[PDB]
């Protein structure tokens, strides 16, 4: 079965898989379908620009090949902190955006795993006291994928062609979901 690391994402050698995987429709959500590898590489960067190191982009591996990426970014530049969306703020907060990539065959439970391994990461190596997502409502694979390691929604937002569903997973939460991070819930 699936057992994932990570590694924070190297832009010189890592465009051309990201670009591939931000370029099938099944990554429409991210907005990316039809960028240049210049553009990607702004993407990055801009995922990668806040002072703190917590944040960023990371590059997840299974048996020396690439398997997803997701992003760690901080709730106070993203949208969750326009005026008047109802995201209230807690020390610790860290946003996730998760890009699987475009390889289309898979074992069981992969995106769990994938899952998983992230959340792990932002508590226990980015030092998340919570997560904070908000995908777009009508993305109904992300929530189920929240569901599994325990994300709680709190409600929608509006943001300019978009209704977003925000949710929350504490560290507390987590662990009751998944068992310590031993399984799904």
């Not at 553009?39 to 020396?64: Q, S």
Request: hydrophobic share 40%; with cysteine.
């Amino acid at each position: 079965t699936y057992h994932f690391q990570s590694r924070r994402i190297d832009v010189d050698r890592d465009l051309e898989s990201v670009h591939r995987w931000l370029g099938h429709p099944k990554s429409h959500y991210w907005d990316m379908l039809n960028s240049s590898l210049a553009d990607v590489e702004k993407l990055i960067r801009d995922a990668g620009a806040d002072p703190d190191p917590r944040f960023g982009m990371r590059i997840g591996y299974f048996e020396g090949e690439r398997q997803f990426l997701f992003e760690l970014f901080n709730p106070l530049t993203s949208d969750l902190a326009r005026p008047g969306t109802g995201y209230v703020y807690e020390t610790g907060d860290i946003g996730m955006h998760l890009l699987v990539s475009s390889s289309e065959r898979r074992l069981p439970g992969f995106t769990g795993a994938v899952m998983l391994h992230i959340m792990r990461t932002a508590f226990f190596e980015a030092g998340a006291r919570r997560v904070v997502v908000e995908p777009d409502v009508r993305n109904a694979d992300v929530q189920r994928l929240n569901a599994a390691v325990g994300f709680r929604v709190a409600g929608d937002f509006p943001v300019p062609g978009k209704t977003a569903r925000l949710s929350y997973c504490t560290r507390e939460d987590f662990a009751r979901a998944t068992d310590n991070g031993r399984t799904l819930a």
